[PDB]
Design an enzyme around this catalytic site. Structure first.
Site, PDB file in Angstrom:
ATOM      1  N   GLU B  32       0.845  -1.182   0.000  1.00 34.46           N
ATOM      2  CA  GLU B  32       0.000   0.000   0.000  1.00 34.46           C
ATOM      3  C   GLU B  32       0.884   1.237   0.000  1.00 34.46           C
ATOM      4  O   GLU B  32       1.886   1.294   0.718  1.00 34.46           O
ATOM      5  CB  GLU B  32      -0.932   0.016   1.213  1.00 34.46           C
ATOM      6  CG  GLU B  32      -2.014   1.080   1.157  1.00 34.46           C
ATOM      7  CD  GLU B  32      -2.679   1.168  -0.201  1.00 34.46           C
ATOM      8  OE1 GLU B  32      -3.624   0.392  -0.453  1.00 34.46           O
ATOM      9  OE2 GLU B  32      -2.263   2.019  -1.016  1.00 34.46           O
ATOM     10  N   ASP B 154      12.040  10.714  -3.320  1.00 33.53           N
ATOM     11  CA  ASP B 154      11.541  10.020  -2.132  1.00 33.53           C
ATOM     12  C   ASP B 154      12.387   8.779  -1.888  1.00 33.53           C
ATOM     13  O   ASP B 154      12.184   7.727  -2.494  1.00 33.53           O
ATOM     14  CB  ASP B 154      10.063   9.681  -2.280  1.00 33.53           C
ATOM     15  CG  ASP B 154       9.736   9.079  -3.625  1.00 33.53           C
ATOM     16  OD1 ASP B 154      10.626   9.061  -4.496  1.00 33.53           O
ATOM     17  OD2 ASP B 154       8.587   8.628  -3.813  1.00 33.53           O
TER      18      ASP B 154
HETATM   19  N1  ADP Z   1       8.199  -5.139  -6.483  1.00 28.47           N
HETATM   20  C1  ADP Z   1       7.719  -5.048  -5.246  1.00 28.47           C
HETATM   21  N2  ADP Z   1       7.882  -6.093  -4.401  1.00 28.47           N
HETATM   22  C2  ADP Z   1       7.366  -6.004  -3.168  1.00 28.47           C
HETATM   23  N3  ADP Z   1       6.743  -4.980  -2.591  1.00 28.47           N
HETATM   24  C3  ADP Z   1       6.595  -3.961  -3.452  1.00 28.47           C
HETATM   25  C4  ADP Z   1       7.045  -3.915  -4.756  1.00 28.47           C
HETATM   26  N4  ADP Z   1       6.705  -2.706  -5.343  1.00 28.47           N
HETATM   27  C5  ADP Z   1       6.074  -2.053  -4.403  1.00 28.47           C
HETATM   28  N5  ADP Z   1       5.977  -2.754  -3.226  1.00 28.47           N
HETATM   29  C6  ADP Z   1       5.348  -2.315  -1.986  1.00 28.47           C
HETATM   30  O1  ADP Z   1       4.334  -1.384  -2.289  1.00 28.47           O
HETATM   31  C7  ADP Z   1       4.611  -0.115  -1.645  1.00 28.47           C
HETATM   32  C8  ADP Z   1       4.152   1.009  -2.539  1.00 28.47           C
HETATM   33  O2  ADP Z   1       4.756   0.851  -3.843  1.00 28.47           O
HETATM   34  P1  ADP Z   1       5.468   2.130  -4.491  1.00 28.47           P
HETATM   35  O3  ADP Z   1       5.956   1.765  -5.852  1.00 28.47           O
HETATM   36  O4  ADP Z   1       6.448   2.686  -3.518  1.00 28.47           O
HETATM   37  O5  ADP Z   1       4.224   3.129  -4.627  1.00 28.47           O
HETATM   38  P2  ADP Z   1       3.962   4.695  -4.334  1.00 28.47           P
HETATM   39  O6  ADP Z   1       4.398   5.426  -5.553  1.00 28.47           O
HETATM   40  O7  ADP Z   1       2.480   4.806  -4.152  1.00 28.47           O
HETATM   41  O8  ADP Z   1       4.752   5.081  -3.108  1.00 28.47           O
HETATM   42  C9  ADP Z   1       6.113  -0.162  -1.353  1.00 28.47           C
HETATM   43  O9  ADP Z   1       6.445   0.701  -0.276  1.00 28.47           O
HETATM   44  C10 ADP Z   1       6.311  -1.640  -1.012  1.00 28.47           C
HETATM   45  O10 ADP Z   1       5.964  -1.939   0.321  1.00 28.47           O
HETATM   46  F1  BEF Z   2       4.362   6.910  -1.739  1.00 23.85           F
HETATM   47 BE1  BEF Z   2       5.391   6.539  -2.986  1.00 23.85          BE
HETATM   48  F2  BEF Z   2       6.807   6.460  -2.083  1.00 23.85           F
HETATM   49  F3  BEF Z   2       5.089   7.743  -4.140  1.00 23.85           F
HETATM   50 MG    MG Z   3       6.065   6.797  -5.647  1.00 25.12          MG
HETATM   51 MG    MG Z   4       6.813   4.514  -2.758  1.00 20.46          MG
END
Ligand code: ADP
Ligand code: BEF
Ligand code: MG
Ligand code: MG
Ligand code: ZN
Ligand code: ZN
Ligand code: ZN
Lengths: 137, 402, 47, 291
Positions: B32, B154
């Site tokens: 999430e 970030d």
């Molecule tokens: N390839 C992956 N394997 C495992 N967990 C993942 C992976 N990609 C994302 N996540 C999980 O999903 C969360 C949110 O994904 P992320 O790409 O950081 O989205 P956002 O842009 O909304 O921050 C990450 O903090 C992690 O916990």
């Molecule tokens: F919340 Be992601 F790190 F845009």
């Molecule tokens: Mg992001």
């Molecule tokens: Mg992220």
């Protein structure tokens, strides 16, 4: 007050905040947070609000959680011990450096002895506020 | 054996995605995020398994991580995301995209699932060996990233997926990541913030005053980041944000490990972060940084426990952080923080053979960790050493095995 | 409930997301493929 | 949160609603409220009215936006803002002006347009509403309708010359030449009792310089109403509009206009004894828009 301004005054000040002395009466809720450390690995600038590390119920709960996670922490240390790698570590069980520090276990024993008897995005906004806005506010 | 309250959204997304029923089978929601949610799914067709098969860590079964962005996100922003993930494919530390498609507004990205463990689980009980390896992998990843010439604004443990059993980690989110534009077509004029537009009367001084009626504009600089993990560059809206904000965030994460405090910098706004930095370092140092970036700064009347204190270094700070835990007894008997506590006790002046070897090595490791912390924690960007320079530290002797 | 935010696609702030997605402007924006042409350009380059 | 005293207006909520209305207004909504859906156009109704208007506002460079209140009635999210606009002219109008400036600068920023924001943030934007309900005449406006939007139509009989209105006084200290400029607030100027400098203090050093003050236009227009409805045995009534700034010298004698503005009341001084005011208030109308 705290004041940060453009040296050439070409752009508006970024942060400009001043506080009356009277609202600073309480040390717990300074508008500028203080390094009230607290405990239990919380934020250094926040503390144990509605929390007491010596509260025996809290001590018991934390002790139970800790003894639950003893094996996992031991596994972590066994996985990671002075070889700078995991697969390189593949072929002594533990090393305990003594300390005079109090911990959950020693404090628990002391207590038992004592009682033994939203979105993340927002619309772009303008900088200059009209004088009528200032009057309305 | 899964919460059905998540299953309803699972099936809702499923029938909201008519081009996926045959292609993939949804397994579970794993991640999430603020800008998106992440779903675990099985790969029906094996071509994706063959594609980037080397990329897929072979630990366990091979699964695929599904990136369901939120609809509200800008299409231009999503284009930036997908393009950036495209142009750093095959790095083994950066996650390369495998597939991407959209259904009207909704857009889904296909990423290799990375079995990881939550940062909350292990930050308390990680041996300095763990910090060493984790930071080595992360700095190698950022070395590649900065070599490619972008900025991943970030940087945080939530956005970095590290596996202990493998002993390796990879970066995943690039959501706010920004490609370093052409800065220009000495260091005092490097960043006094006079770049791009607006480049190249006396007797009135607003040193101790704020205008009653304000008729001027604010800096317009990117502020993307996280609550905390934000560099003085962006914090004071200092122009021409450099890649080294990333290594600043890296150092913040590093210090979070050394002290066992996860919400290390609870900054509800810019002011909170600036005042926290003033507490840690000192009013004069922050004023010096602002002056370096062509920015006036002033603060008086406020009371600090350390008035321009902690000039000894970060050692005293983590020292009393661990001191109060020691007095209380928060940590368990087996907590690996006690060795660090003894290290600071010895250095601040405030069978046995294997024991002495072990303690000597941890002396050296804690030493080098604390002299790389101050190496990264310096307000001067030009003086702040690059990621390759960080990797060239004497602390990172495990890369020498090549 | 808590789904209150800013829809930069529609440049609008919503108290509820489930109603913004079904809003006339947002629905029209979704139905317009001209806004996603650059995305599709790299989508097709995958295959 | 935080409604203003004496009003039902909350700044944050009203700004949010006005931005929402600006972003997502289509003329098809007005067609629906007009029950003219059989005349719905595919081209004009699809296009976003006020966003486009703000665009051509940016290129042309004008500073005044004319808003149709019935468009606000058309948008469901801003139906309450309509009544808020009628009942509270000045506050809601200022809210709208600030929101217009915000939307202009935001639209420039989001598209990353090459056009500089120097002019935009320095400029002052004004919102001029119109089509605000019915007329109701002037015999039917009770004293409870002071400071509300009203719609009047009639014939412009007479137009007075331009009357300068003081905005900033220019009191000059005789002794130390401490020339302070006093802005007028709510039609009141406060004299410095003594010299505002600390080193120099002389109450008689003040002597207002009439010629170096900064003034603003004011024109009083005599409008004879022609209401859509007339009560039994009612001779035509004349009301005194008061235009300001750019609207001065716009309405000529003999023009049949429809005017919207704020129904005001001001005490009239009984000149028999100075600084003694009659208990019956004279009624006039500030003018915001002329059609
Ligand atoms: N390839 C992956 N394997 C495992 N967990 C993942 C992976 N990609 C994302 N996540 C999980 O999903 C969360 C949110 O994904 P992320 O790409 O950081 O989205 P956002 O842009 O909304 O921050 C990450 O903090 C992690 O916990
Ligand atoms: F919340 Be992601 F790190 F845009
Ligand atoms: Mg992001
Ligand atoms: Mg992220
Ligand atoms: Zn700078
Ligand atoms: Zn939308
Ligand atoms: Zn004087």
């Amino acid at each position: 007050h705290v004041y940060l301004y453009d040296l050439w005054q070409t752009w508006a000040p970024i942060i400009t905040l001043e506080w009356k002395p009277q609202e600073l009466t309480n040390l717990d809720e300074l508008p500028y947070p203080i390094l009230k450390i607290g405990s239990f690995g919380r934020c250094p600038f926040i503390g144990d609000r509605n929390y007491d590390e010596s509260s025996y119920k809290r001590v018991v709960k934390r002790y139970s959680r800790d003894k639950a996670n003893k094996k996992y922490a031991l596994q972590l240390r066994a996985l990671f011990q002075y070889h700078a790698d995991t697969l390189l570590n593949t072929s002594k069980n533990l090393i305990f450096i003594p300390h005079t520090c109090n911990d959950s276990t020693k404090s628990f024993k002391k207590w038992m002895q004592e009682k033994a008897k939203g979105n993340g995005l927002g619309p772009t906004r303008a900088s200059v506020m009209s004088k009528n806005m200032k009057s309305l506010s | 054996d899964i919460p059905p309250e998540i299953k309803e959204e699972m099936i809702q997304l499923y029938h909201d995605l008519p081009g996926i029923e045959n292609e993939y089978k949804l397994i579970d929601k794993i991640g999430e995020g603020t800008f998106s949610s992440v779903y675990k799914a099985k790969d029906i067709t094996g071509k994706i398994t063959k594609k980037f098969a080397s990329h897929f860590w072979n630990y366990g079964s091979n699964y695929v991580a599904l990136k369901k962005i939120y609809v509200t996100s800008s299409p231009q922003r999503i284009y930036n995301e997908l393009n950036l993930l495209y142009i750093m494919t095959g790095s083994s530390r950066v996650a390369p995209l495998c597939d991407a498609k959209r259904v009207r507004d909704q857009v889904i990205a296909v990423l290799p699932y990375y079995p990881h463990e939550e940062f909350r689980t292990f930050y308390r009980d990680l041996p300095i060996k763990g910090i060493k390896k984790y930071i080595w992998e992360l700095l190698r990843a950022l070395k590649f990233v900065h070599s490619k010439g972008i900025i991943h604004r970030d940087i945080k443990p939530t956005n970095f997926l590290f596996n202990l059993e493998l002993g390796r980690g990879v970066l995943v989110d690039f959501g706010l990541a920004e490609a370093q534009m052409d800065y220009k077509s000495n260091h005092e004029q490097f960043c006094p913030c006079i770049m791009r537009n607006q480049y190249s009367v006396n007797g009135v001084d607003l040193t101790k005053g704020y205008p009653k009626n304000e008729t001027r504009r604010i800096k317009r600089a990117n502020r993307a980041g996280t609550r905390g993990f934000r560099a003085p560059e962006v914090l004071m809206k200092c122009g021409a944000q450099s890649t080294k904000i990333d290594i600043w965030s890296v150092g913040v994460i590093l210090l979070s490990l050394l002290g066992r405090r996860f919400p290390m910098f609870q900054s509800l706004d810019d002011a909170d972060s600036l005042l926290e930095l003033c507490t840690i370092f000192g009013w004069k140092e922050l004023r010096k940084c602002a002056a370096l970036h062509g920015l006036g700064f002033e603060a008086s009347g406020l009371i600090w426990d350390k008035p321009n204190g902690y000039s000894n270094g970060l050692k005293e700070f983590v020292y009393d952080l661990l001191n109060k835990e020691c007095t209380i007894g928060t940590f368990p008997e087996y907590s690996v923080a006690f060795e660090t506590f003894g290290f600071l006790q010895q250095e601040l002046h405030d069978d046995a053979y294997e024991l002495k070897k072990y303690q000597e090595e941890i002396w050296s490791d804690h030493y080098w960790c604390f002299q790389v912390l101050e190496q990264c924690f310096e307000m001067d960007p030009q003086k702040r050493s690059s990621a390759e320079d960080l990797l060239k530290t004497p602390f990172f002797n495990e890369l020498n095995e090549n | 409930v808590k789904n209150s935010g800013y829809c930069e696609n529609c440049r609008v702030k919503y108290e509820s997301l489930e109603q913004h997605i079904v809003s006339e402007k947002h629905l029209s924006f979704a139905e317009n493929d001209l806004n996603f042409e650059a995305i599709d350009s790299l989508i097709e380059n995958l295959r | 949160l935080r409604i203003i005293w004496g009003t039902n207006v909350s700044i944050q909520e009203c700004t949010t609603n006005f931005r929402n209305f600006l972003m997502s207004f289509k003329y098809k909504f007005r067609k629906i409220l007009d029950e003219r859906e059989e005349f719905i156009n595919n081209t004009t109704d699809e296009e976003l009215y006020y966003i486009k208007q703000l665009n051509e506002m940016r290129e042309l460079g004008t500073s005044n936006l004319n808003l149709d209140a019935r468009n606000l009635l058309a948008y469901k999210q801003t139906e309450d803002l309509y009544h808020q606009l009628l009942n509270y002219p000045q506050e809601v109008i200022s809210i709208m002006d600030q929101t217009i400036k915000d939307c202009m600068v935001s639209l420039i920023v989001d598209n990353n347009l090459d056009y500089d924001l120097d002019e935009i943030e320095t400029k002052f934007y004004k919102v001029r509403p119109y089509n605000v309900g019915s007329c109701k005449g002037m015999r039917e406006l009770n004293p409870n309708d002071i400071d509300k939007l009203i719609n009047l139509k009639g014939l412009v009989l007479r137009s007075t010359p331009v009357i300068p209105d003081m905005k900033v006084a220019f009191f000059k200290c005789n002794v130390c030449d401490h020339t302070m400029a006093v802005e007028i607030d709510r039609g009141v100027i406060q004299e410095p009792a003594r010299c505002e400098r600390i080193d120099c203090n002389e109450p008689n050093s003040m002597s207002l310089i009439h010629n170096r003050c900064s003034f603003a236009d004011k024109q009083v227009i005599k409008l004879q109403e022609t209401p859509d409805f007339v009560p039994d045995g009612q001779t035509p009534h004349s009301i005194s509009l008061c235009v300001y700034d750019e609207l001065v010298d716009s309405c000529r004698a003999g023009d049949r206009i429809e005017v919207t503005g704020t129904f005001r009341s001001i005490p009239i001084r009984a000149n028999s004894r100075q600084r003694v005011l009659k208990s019956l208030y004279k009624t006039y109308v500030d003018v915001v828009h002329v059609k």
